[PDB]
Design an enzyme around this catalytic site. Structure first.
Site, PDB file in Angstrom:
ATOM      1  N   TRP A  55     -10.936  -1.321  14.422  1.00  0.00           N
ATOM      2  CA  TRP A  55      -9.912  -2.296  14.786  1.00  0.00           C
ATOM      3  C   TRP A  55      -9.676  -2.260  16.306  1.00  0.00           C
ATOM      4  O   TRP A  55      -9.760  -3.288  16.992  1.00  0.00           O
ATOM      5  CB  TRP A  55      -8.612  -2.045  14.010  1.00  0.00           C
ATOM      6  N   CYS A  94      -9.776  -6.809   7.572  1.00  0.00           N
ATOM      7  CA  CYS A  94      -8.600  -5.931   7.524  1.00  0.00           C
ATOM      8  C   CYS A  94      -7.378  -6.662   6.933  1.00  0.00           C
ATOM      9  O   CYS A  94      -6.354  -6.028   6.683  1.00  0.00           O
ATOM     10  CB  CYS A  94      -8.278  -5.404   8.919  1.00  0.00           C
ATOM     11  N   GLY A  95      -7.490  -7.979   6.701  1.00  0.00           N
ATOM     12  CA  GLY A  95      -6.392  -8.809   6.184  1.00  0.00           C
ATOM     13  C   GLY A  95      -6.039  -8.464   4.748  1.00  0.00           C
ATOM     14  O   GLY A  95      -5.162  -7.634   4.498  1.00  0.00           O
ATOM     15  N   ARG A 148     -14.555   5.461   1.852  1.00  0.00           N
ATOM     16  CA  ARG A 148     -13.395   4.612   1.755  1.00  0.00           C
ATOM     17  C   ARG A 148     -13.665   3.563   0.678  1.00  0.00           C
ATOM     18  O   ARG A 148     -14.795   3.072   0.568  1.00  0.00           O
ATOM     19  CB  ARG A 148     -13.119   3.970   3.117  1.00  0.00           C
ATOM     20  N   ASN A 150      -4.412   6.394   5.233  1.00  0.00           N
ATOM     21  CA  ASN A 150      -4.240   5.565   6.412  1.00  0.00           C
ATOM     22  C   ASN A 150      -2.798   5.054   6.441  1.00  0.00           C
ATOM     23  O   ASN A 150      -2.204   4.732   5.401  1.00  0.00           O
ATOM     24  CB  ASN A 150      -5.268   4.431   6.496  1.00  0.00           C
TER      25      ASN A 150
END
Ligand SMILES: CC(=O)SCCNC(=O)CCNC(=O)[C@H](O)C(C)(C)COP(=O)(O)OP(=O)(O)OC[C@H]1O[C@@H](n2cnc3c(N)ncnc32)[C@H](O)[C@@H]1OP(=O)(O)O
Ligand SMILES: CC(=O)SCCNC(=O)CCNC(=O)[C@H](O)C(C)(C)COP(=O)(O)OP(=O)(O)OC[C@H]1O[C@@H](n2cnc3c(N)ncnc32)[C@H](O)[C@@H]1OP(=O)(O)O
Ligand SMILES: [Mg+2]
Ligand SMILES: [Mg+2]
Ligand SMILES: [Mg+2]
Lengths: 429, 722, 719
Positions: free
Chosen positions: C97, C204-205, C238, C459
């Site tokens: 990011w 990432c939305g 992940r 996270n």
């Protein structure tokens, strides 16, 4: 002794043994083992490709030196070329800044070798070669593992070890530049580096080459050794001299260079700088606005006058008048016309000035009135030491300042003797 | 021929460009022809740099004429650069110090010695320019989705890349300068600064080495040539380091010769230094083997040895080596001896300029001679002295071991260098360590005497301790404006970004270890308060424009209240404005009084944005966590708006917003006494204690607050009317 | 032969490495032989990554055993990374990011779509590693110049590169993963996280997952590359299955239980209906919406879909929308409204559920079936359902236009993916949007049930509004420790560095415009107070070590009080300690990071005898008041000896205080301030019992006590 003190003393001792090893027989370091260990920190690093290549490569060159044999190679222009030459059985690779300049990069336009590329450029090029060699070794080894013992004895195995000597130019500045350049080479696995005694800003491949004093060159070589020692890599340092073809030096401070300085013997002549600028100003004043180079300097009226006097007597202002008239009759670019005049003017100035070394100057006095005994003394003597010996029993008129270029570079007697002098000074480093 | 025509056309265009007012008083040592022959036939266009350079130069000239200036710092990230433009700073500085400190994927971080590849600062600048251009694209995308009314309300930030970037010494000669300038222009940078240091010895700390003025001028001319080829009217800043420099690597330039220091029967400084170092080695300090670098003759070592013994320096060495043995690193010990040696050598040599030397003989008028010597070559000064007083003087004697000549550094030498460079540079900069208006004035006046239109630049070292100057806080506030008045149009805190980046990281890393996720909550609260774009990161990095791009690429076929809102008070003020029949829609603002302060200002603003009222206060907690509102100032500027319970409404909001148990007023006025007393009667406070002129303490009436905050607004309606 | 021996030797060494406890419970889909084949004969050594990976793994195992954790953030600069380690954070996170947001010399900054070259995050990490190694070298150089007593006093920071870096989805297949891992290892990074998103759609939305076999192959590929390079790198798997609604294949049996299908099979495909709706817009004259031209859908399909669109009134909405468009004269907003309503209509009518939920509806044993369906292939579940007498269900109907299948995202699906990945990863991570201990517990317990030793990671999104959770400030403080207890050993605020960088820039830029050079003064003051290394930048970047290098290279031939010092009080406390026959140190730091609230502490040789917690405040004319919220003379035997009176005298002098306010005073405070009035330190003292004390400073008496002769002061100490 605390664990901290022990760890340090241990590494200083290891480093001292390394210094004292036969690898560095006859090599002078201007620093101690302590000064090296201080730089290394506590987190281990290991430049194994460069370290092991440097070891094997040095031993091999020593083997060939003792046998009076040698490697004959060229600079590969691609990773393929480098892998190919090793297949064909050439034992080592050269990598030069000329080819790097000519190739350019994604951000560097190709061009002549002026070492004007970023100091990362040649290391980045070398990195491609090393990766190609290591990959070739991995590919070969994979295939040889699939082979039987009989096939292995039949099919030859190529030596893809990265025995490279790469171009580090002039060092791209001072000691922090050299150390950075050497670091970048070592990190990508290069075991050898060559540094030349040119002035960085004027670096060329030959006309008008400018040397640096020997103390500057030695510091470059010492800086390189320091960086190599920190990184525990017995890298091969090649000292290049350009003194064979060079005519200029950017300082007269080093005693080793002073015997080769050129000076005027006819001291009623005005400075070469004064005369050059006065000639240019005449062109300007006669209406060639293009030639405004004299505006770079703030030369006094007295200096312009004296130089003017000399320029008229020698018929140079004559040549300028003729040249400007030739220009008007044709008013195209004056590049060619000005060149002829300057060439004629330089010849005139060099001839009237009586350009020779302080050696040659005092030798003339004695040949008029022991001669060969003096030459031997002058060739190894500082300027101050040679003047002191000449005044004792023939102190002729001699000025090197008169002969300086507009930039302020001194003239020197380039040739193999001067190359020898520089190389002998550099040899212990 | 068409070939000849095309050429003549471009030469003419180039000549008009040269002759434009942009380059008034600028000397080029080359012709339009020489530029055109470099350009080839295939068109190129560096439009970002070209247009930025135009606008940026015009703006600086506007500010120079108004005696105003830009005050900026070096951003350490693309975010910092975009942020400073949001906050309304008009231009950016980018320095080699921060670039050195940051390192790269292949460059270890370290001090600024310009030892990075010459691509390093351009690569850094490229990140900034891409960030600015991307910010512009993201902003513009959003503004297109907006209506005309929203566009007139929502402000539009200027993200043009007005950058002046560090080109160091030029990283060598003219091909290096041209390459460095080319790399800057290609990534859109419109300004570049070049200093008159020797590349190999470049520094920011004592022993700075200068180059002759002809070398510096050639760097500036080379830069201009490259800029002209690329059709970019780039801003060239000439920096001089002559203020602090004591050395120069050549004595060939006539302009430097007046400042040369010379000695005599004394042996060379080099000889004595090396002989002294050799004595330390011979006495058993093996570390100091520096003499092996040189091949100094026996006669020279002898003469120097003689002098060293007579002056008692060999004595100091013996003592020093004994001190060393009795005690390890000899850094400190050697330093003491060297300084004493230097003092002794300078003293005995009679170290002064050829000016000062001929001035001593005259015991031509004295002050008349100084004026001649200060503008005279060495050869011209000798000729004039002999004609009148030809004393003994040698600068060669005073050379360092490297072969550098000593010079009289200071503001006069800085002036001399800068004046020589002025016809080749758009902006002049004298490197300073200390922030001092008088030093700046000496420089600016000397420059403007000969070049009234010459724009200047001033550096503000982040490491200079501002609290040692003896300046008041108000003098510190005014220092940038004072620079502007003297014609310093562009003033910069070089590696400011690096400093604030560090402090921020220390704080947040400490806060996370101390308060866990509350550290993030507090940061989020701060962002909400000042309405930072970082509040919505996905939007900040350009999520909306990126979503639009995805739609286009695929043809559209691809698949709790945290704080009491300011709106609540605005609604109360609507009721209030209604009852007293004001035509004015009242807006509420709550920001820190100054950036980063715990002290907040609540402002009430009308349609014109005139401030009708305010409260300056800070929340404070007691040991058990109870909150108190500390009021240091409040005002109802409109005399006609007073005694209508405007401030009572504001207090009710503040008490609710901050969950305040009490309100303390420090150094109250009479109006404050009357106000808090009547607020006690309305029941907002239970108890009110007042030491006249010192403090008011007012305890909050929690029941009465709860009653007034009932969403029906009955009790609140009664409070506003009665 | 020697050739065969050398090989067998390395295969044996490699096998021992495989069998070491480091890889207990790890499955490799390859042999030691396959690793050695790749290594060639020319030695390489990635020692930074190798040694970091070893120490970092052991440390995480310690913390896991102790049910403790590291809490960290992503630094946005090498300075931030070096600073965090100074402040005592043990490890660093580096995310894609922040890398996307920063851009590069050739990469425009933007959202995190992993669209940067796969070299981008490694290049970023390289800067951090060089900064850490350089910091270590600079520190070590200084510590060598120090004496053994100075070394025991001055603390030494751990600058080892314990980094876990973002490897995205692997940027393609196995050659991409191996290249990405190689680049990380080469620059000294010992840990890497790989997610189970489809590379082309990474976000990432609308997240799209890949089958588990693809994810496992990524993890196996990574391990292979790490093994070749002799680096025991930490592989973090992940899963994005918690929030994902789509998967790009239905081929993996582990994913099939979560597939959504239509139960009302008289409905035409979602794709057909979407394209037919778009074509209607186009045919009614909206040329802008030509998306249907991407596909070559048959007439029969357009007809069937058209039929459904008319019956459901969607073509109605289109006609209305196009008329609204014409009357106004961009159709972005209008089309969106219609689409959402269309999607709602289609989902509703289609009856979207899992094949589990479908057969569960028919049966009306129920709970027995759920258990079978949740672990059953699609073919196995159909065979068992028909045997039990097979409802209508089609997942093909529900596919998107791209051809992605719909799945039931959530924690159960995250668990399923993570359990499949567990034998191939050292750490498991479920991507979360919201911070919620219950969700974390559901995940952790499910994993630990089958793998008790499996370390986890959590996270903490910087964008998650923490003040909407309803948690207390104290619950927020404890949240990291609570994660640690459940076996989340490595927890990170992904792009924290990016956020603090922005805030810092806004503040300083605003401050510079507001207050000119006073903005720099205030920053300098802050740095002096906390004794930040940034106080002396030349030293911070390694000037001393660099000077030493210059000396070596050249053979040594190269050529006012701002604040009242803490030392003043230390000297007073020496007088005091002498008289009462007791070495006291003074510390003055912010009570918490960045706070205006300071703590003055008095420390003994063993280290806190007394403290004052206070903040200076100014009135509108600039007068300074000290606001004291707490104070202690902890030792009962040190009380009533005027220790606190000395501290007050210093504070009043240090801060030029006109008054001292004590908020919520105790009885001891009442007695103390009253007697301090008698000694003449205060002229006036007003006290509202239990609320506030206000004490005006007696300036003459302060001036008298501060006279450098220390006559009055000596008398004050002795009484
Ligand atoms: C620590 C510090 O803040 S000191 C700095 C104080 N600032 C100043 O003195 C600046 C000049 N003064 C002013 O601007 C204003 O008068 C302020 C800010 C003090 C008060 O603003 P106002 O809007 O008048 O206060 P507000 O109307 O809310 O006062 C509440 C009650 O006090 C009464 N009141 C306010 N001022 C006065 C006065 N001068 N005389 C009598 N009563 C008063 C109001 O009438 C009201 O009660 P009521 O309506 O029941 O009669
Ligand atoms: C700050 C707040 O708002 S919260 C309250 C502060 N903290 C506490 O109450 C925690 C417990 N209390 C303490 O630690 C201590 O009692 C303190 C901090 C209040 C005072 O610490 P000391 O070091 O005893 O203060 P110090 O010695 O300077 O006192 C100054 C004078 O007050 C007198 N004094 C202080 N405490 C007492 C007491 N309990 N009884 C009688 N006299 C006292 C002292 O004797 C001295 O006068 P003298 O020596 O001339 O007789
Ligand atoms: Mg040799
Ligand atoms: Mg100018
Ligand atoms: Mg596992």
């Amino acid at each position: 002794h605390t664990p901290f003190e022990q760890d340090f003393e241990k590494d200083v001792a290891a480093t001292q043994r390394y210094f004292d090893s036969s690898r560095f027989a006859g090599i002078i370091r201007l620093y101690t083992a302590r000064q090296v260990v201080e730089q290394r920190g506590t987190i281990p690093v290991d430049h194994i490709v460069a370290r092991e290549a440097a070891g094997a490569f040095y031993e091999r060159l020593r083997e060939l030196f003792a046998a009076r044999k040698s490697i004959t190679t060229f600079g590969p222009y691609s990773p393929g070329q480098a892998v190919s030459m090793k297949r064909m059985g050439i034992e080592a690779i050269y990598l030069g800044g000329w080819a790097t300049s000519a190739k350019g990069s994604s951000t560097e336009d190709p061009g002549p070798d002026l070492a004007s590329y970023p100091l990362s450029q040649v290391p980045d090029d070398a990195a491609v070669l090393v990766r190609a060699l290591l990959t070739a070794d991995r590919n070969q080894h994979y295939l040889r593992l699939q082979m039987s013992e009989r096939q292995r004895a039949a099919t030859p195995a190529y030596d893809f070890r990265p025995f490279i000597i790469a171009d580090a130019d002039t060092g791209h500045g001072g000691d922090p530049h050299v150390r950075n350049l050497i670091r970048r080479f070592v990190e990508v696995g290069v075991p050898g580096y060559h540094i030349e005694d040119q002035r960085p800003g004027t670096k060329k491949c030959g006309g008008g080459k400018v040397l640096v004093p020997s103390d500057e060159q030695i510091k470059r070589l010492n800086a390189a050794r320091f960086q190599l020692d920190i990184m525990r890599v017995p890298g091969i340092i090649v000292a290049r001299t350009d003194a064979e073809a060079a005519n200029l030096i950017d300082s007269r401070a080093d005693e080793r260079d002073q015997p080769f300085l050129l000076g005027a013997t006819k001291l009623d002549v005005p400075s070469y700088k004064s005369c050059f600028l006065a000639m240019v100003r005449r062109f300007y004043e006669l209406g060639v606005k293009e030639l405004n180079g004299h505006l770079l300097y703030a030369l006094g009226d007295s200096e312009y006058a004296a130089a003017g006097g000399w320029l008229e007597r020698q018929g140079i202002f004559g040549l300028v008048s003729d040249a400007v008239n030739a220009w008007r009759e044709d008013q195209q670019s004056i590049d060619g016309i000005f060149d002829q005049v300057e060439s004629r003017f330089v010849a005139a100035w060099e001839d009237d000035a009586g350009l020779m070394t302080y050696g040659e100057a005092v030798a003339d006095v004695l040949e008029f009135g022991a001669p060969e005994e003096w030459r031997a003394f002058a060739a190894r003597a500082s300027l101050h030491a040679a003047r002191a010996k000449a005044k004792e029993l023939a102190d002729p008129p001699w000025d090197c300042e008169l002969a300086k270029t507009p930039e302020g570079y001194y003239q020197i007697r380039g040739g193999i003797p001067y190359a020898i002098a520089k190389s002998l000074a550099a040899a212990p480093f | 021929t068409p070939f000849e025509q095309d050429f003549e056309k471009d030469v003419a265009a180039t000549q008009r460009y040269f002759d434009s007012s942009r380059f008034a008083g600028i000397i080029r040592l080359y012709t339009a022809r020489q530029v055109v022959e470099q350009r080839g036939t295939i068109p190129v266009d560096h439009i970002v740099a070209r247009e930025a350079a135009g606008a940026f130069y015009e703006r600086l000239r506007e500010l120079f004429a108004a005696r105003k200036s830009i005050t900026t710092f070096g951003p350490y990230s693309p975010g910092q650069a975009v942020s400073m433009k949001r906050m309304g700073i008009e231009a950016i500085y980018l320095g080699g110090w921060a670039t050195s400190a940051k390192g790269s994927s292949t460059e270890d971080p370290g001090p600024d010695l310009a030892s990075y590849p010459l691509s390093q600062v351009p690569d850094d600048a490229a990140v900034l320019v891409r960030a600015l251009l991307t910010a512009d694209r993201n902003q513009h995308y959003l503004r297109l989705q907006m209506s005309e009314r929203q566009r007139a309300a929502t402000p539009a930030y200027d993200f043009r890349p007005f950058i002046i970037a560090d080109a160091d010494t030029g990283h060598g000669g003219d091909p290096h300068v041209r390459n460095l300038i080319r790399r800057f222009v290609e990534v859109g940078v419109p300004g570049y600064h070049i200093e008159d240091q020797r590349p190999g010895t470049k520094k920011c700390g004592g022993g700075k080495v200068l180059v002759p003025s002809d070398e510096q001028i050639k760097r500036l001319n080379a830069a201009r040539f490259q800029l002209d080829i690329m059709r970019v009217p780039g801003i060239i800043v000439a920096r001089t380091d002559a203020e602090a420099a004591n050395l120069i690597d050549s004595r060939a330039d006539e302009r430097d010769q007046p400042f040369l220091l010379g000695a005599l029967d004394v042996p060379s400084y080099k000889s004595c230094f090396l002989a002294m170092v050799r004595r330390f080695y011979e006495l058993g300090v093996k570390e100091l083997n520096g003499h092996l670098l040189y091949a100094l003759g026996d006669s020279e070592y002898a003469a120097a040895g003689g002098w060293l013994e007579r002056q008692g320096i060999f004595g100091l060495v013996s003592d020093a080596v004994n001190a060393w043995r009795e005690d390890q690193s000899i850094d400190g010990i050697f330093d003491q001896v060297e300084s004493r040696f230097v003092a002794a050598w300078e003293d005995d040599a009679g170290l002064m300029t050829y000016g000062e030397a001929v001035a001593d003989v005259l015991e031509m008028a004295p002050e008349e001679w100084r004026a001649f010597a200060a503008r005279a070559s060495l050869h011209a000064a000798r000729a004039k002295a002999k004609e009148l007083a030809d004393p003994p003087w040698d600068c060669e004697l005073a050379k360092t071991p490297e072969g550098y000549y000593q010079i009289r550094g200071g503001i006069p030498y800085a002036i001399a260098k800068s004046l020589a460079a002025a016809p080749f540079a758009d902006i002049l900069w004298m490197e300073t360590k200390t922030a001092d208006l008088a030093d700046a004035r000496q420089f600016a006046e000397a420059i403007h005497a000969e070049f009234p239109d010459q724009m200047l630049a001033y550096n503000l070292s982040p490491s200079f301790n501002w609290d040692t100057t003896g300046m008041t806080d108000e003098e510190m506030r005014r220092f940038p404006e004072e620079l502007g008045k003297m014609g310093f149009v562009f003033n910069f805190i070089t590696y400011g970004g690096h400093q604030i980046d560090g402090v921020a990281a220390e704080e947040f890393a400490t806060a996370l270890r101390q308060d866990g996720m509350l550290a993030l909550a507090r940061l989020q609260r701060k962002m909400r308060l000042v309405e930072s774009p970082y509040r919505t990161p996905q939007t900040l990095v350009g999520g909306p424009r990126s979503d639009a791009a995805l739609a286009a690429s695929s043809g559209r076929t691809a698949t709790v209240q945290t704080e009491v809102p300011r709106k609540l008070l605005e609604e109360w003020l609507a009721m209030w404005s209604g009852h007293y029949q004001l035509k004015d829609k009242l807006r509420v603002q709550l920001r820190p009084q100054r950036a980063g302060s715990e002290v907040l200002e609540l402002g009430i603003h009308g349609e014109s944005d005139d401030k009708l009222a305010n409260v300056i206060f800070q929340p404070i907690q007691d040991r058990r966590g109870r909150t108190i509102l500390l009021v240091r100032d409040q005002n109802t500027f409109g005399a006609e708006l007073r005694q209508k319970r405007l401030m009572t409404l504001i207090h009710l909001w503040l008490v609710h917003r901050f969950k305040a148990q009490a309100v303390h007023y420090v150094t109250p006025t009479d109006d404050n006494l009357y106000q808090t007393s009547k607020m006690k009667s309305h029941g907002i406070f239970t108890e009110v204690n007042q030491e006249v002129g010192e403090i008011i303490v007012a305890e909050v009436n929690h029941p009465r607050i709860a009653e007034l905050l009932t969403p029906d607004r009955v009790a609140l309606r009664k409070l506003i009317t009665k």
